[PDB]
Design a protein around this ligand. Structure first.
Ligand SMILES: Nc1nc2c(ncn2[C@@H]2O[C@H](COP(=O)(O)CP(=O)(O)OP(=O)(O)O)[C@@H](O)[C@H]2O)c(=O)[nH]1
Ligand SMILES: Nc1nc2c(ncn2[C@@H]2O[C@H](COP(=O)(O)CP(=O)(O)OP(=O)(O)O)[C@@H](O)[C@H]2O)c(=O)[nH]1
Ligand SMILES: [Mg+2]
Ligand SMILES: [Mg+2]
Lengths: 315, 315
């Protein structure tokens, strides 16, 4: 999986530099601007200067039509950087010429390529004036037509959260942090598998199996639309069971399934547990995602222990 | 984590060889027997001959008291093999002399040593006669005195699942498989992390973000006993949210938490979603176990999309 974060314009460049300093796992950063000095200050993996002939590396002068023309004239350079990319986050502060004007063009180029295109952009603070806000709104109307998902962050709303006497510099740093949180938050759901501390699940198993006494064991596999309920029924309604699980005061139930498992399926398995156990029983549910398990299959294992009359199970 | 599977007696030896052939991830295998010939046919990591002076390499002739004395005579070897061990599975077929008599001694030693001691043994088939079942029953009574969890499997139940004209050898293979399933099943909950295909998580996010339009994004972190509902509230009740999440027809909700998260915590988080969303909204849950997240923390991120009037959000 190839995921790129593209900062467009001054604000966008400033924002990704913060993301780079803090860190976002598994993504590549790209800085895009008509302002050469700002690009040179970028720590992104790749820097793309656009509209060199119309701006001469001096920025778009606050004109969105110039930022739009800059991106169009540099279409190939942009396309080139988007090759072999599965997803892209386009971030910028709308209100000026480059972020506002170039972002919709970059979005169109990416979506045209079938790339999952997500935009996370801001609208200007109130103190910035009406012209800035107007430019941002017109920019959003164009951006909207060329992205898969559009997350708009109102800087005015951020102002409401910030302290009464916050300095402008700090208000913008807050904006940077908000964009960062959004990009990192979504992207890491895809790039970070998550670490599993095996000693942690041994602790959960130990707490239930230590001095537990006689126990009922059940295993079941399921396949298809109702794989969960089917695996659950096979395990809890197993023939090996000589005494009703209904008498157990403790029940450990674990589901091992591919990442595509839905919460609804977990619920269906839970309804089976309830129909085969005491309402007063302490039920501990375990979940393990294992894509080594066939796409339409599921595995269930449960242990029922701590019965009132243990002799009913052993003999 | 050091886990050992100990097969005691003929049935136990035969059962673990099957486990060894099929395979059980991350566990060590130990074969124990008075019967030297059978022991030499084992593919276990360690082979322990017990009662060399009492039975001289032969079996115990169906006498549990002999199996017991054999284990006691070879107690030093048993304690040696149980060193550097966190958990043990003691498996055998009760009814004969070695498995029935030696298993409780080994369990006693392991438990005294602080090892999580799980026993998974079988009671004989009806066709084997009353005497054998009687011996197994007395064995179970001794075993129960010193074990953490005692899982008893009734071969008579297995019979009610196989052909009417089954060959003895196949009845026993059926029993080996059942023992294998139990040991592998519980063991791998602790030794196998589970594989995560990242392209699969991308599919879940793509399905909700592709051509979704304007979206609302919320992020929250929680800590302590009610970390789940608190992180959910912070995300679902952000001041940046300009349009009620209730108007969204689609909602993706992901929880990233340590492996110690309880299913009850997912419920409290779920109740918050439902109280801030529409009953007709297609809600999708995501769960990622990441023990890099502090043991008492949790992270929540949600994206609400596909509204009827996006203008309300964008402008
Ligand atoms: N997250 C941030 N937003 C910022 C920052 N500075 C400004 N802004 C916001 O973005 C808006 C201006 O963004 P830029 O400076 O990127 C304008 P851009 O460079 O794209 O236009 P041109 O200079 O005309 O080329 C401004 O109206 C603010 O609402 C910053 O450091 N971080
Ligand atoms: N899972 C299996 N169970 C078996 C097998 N053979 C027998 N059995 C079951 O286990 C019981 C006997 O187990 P063993 O053959 O291990 C008797 P053991 O060797 O422990 O006693 P001695 O020979 O007196 O030393 C018997 O009553 C059956 O119910 C086998 O190959 N696999
Ligand atoms: Mg600029
Ligand atoms: Mg024997």
């Amino acid at each position: 999986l190839k995921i790129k974060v593209i900062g467009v314009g001054g604000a966008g460049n400033n924002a990704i530099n913060r993301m780079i300093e803090i860190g976002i796992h598994g993504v590549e950063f790209v800085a895009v601007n008509t302002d050469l000095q700002v690009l040179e200050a970028s720590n992104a993996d790749v820097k793309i200067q656009i509209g060199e002939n119309i701006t001469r590396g001096l920025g778009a002068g606050g004109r969105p039509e110039i930022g739009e023309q800059a991106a169009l004239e540099s279409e190939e350079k942009i396309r080139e950087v988007l090759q072999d990319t599965h997803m892209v986050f386009i971030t910028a502060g709308f209100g000026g010429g480059t972020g506002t004007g170039a972002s919709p063009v970059i979005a169109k180029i990416a979506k045209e390529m079938g790339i999952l295109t997500v935009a996370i952009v801001t609208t200007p603070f109130y103190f910035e004036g009406p012209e800035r806000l107007k430019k941002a709104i017109e920019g959003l109307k164009k951006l909207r037509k060329h992205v898969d998902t559009l997350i708009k962050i109102s800087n005015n709303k951020l102002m409401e959260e910030l302290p009464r006497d916050v300095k402008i510099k700090d208000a913008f740093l807050k904006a940077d942090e908000t964009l960062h949180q959004g990009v990192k938050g979504i992207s890491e759901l895809i790039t970070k598998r998550g670490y599993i501390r095996l000693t942690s699940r041994f602790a959960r198993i130990e707490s239930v199996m230590k001095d537990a006494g006689a126990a009922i064991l059940g295993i079941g596999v399921g396949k298809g639309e109702h794989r969960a309920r089917e695996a659950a029924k096979k395990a809890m309604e197993s023939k090996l069971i000589e005494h009703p699980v209904e008498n157990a005061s403790s029940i450990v139930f674990n589901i091992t399934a591919p990442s595509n498992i839905r919460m609804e399926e977990v619920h269906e398995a839970a309804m089976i547990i309830r129909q085969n156990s005491s309402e007063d029983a302490d039920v501990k549910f375990g979940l393990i995602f294992d894509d080594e398990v066939p796409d339409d299959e599921i595995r269930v294992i449960f242990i029922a222990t701590r019965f009132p009359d243990e002799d009913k199970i052993l003999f």
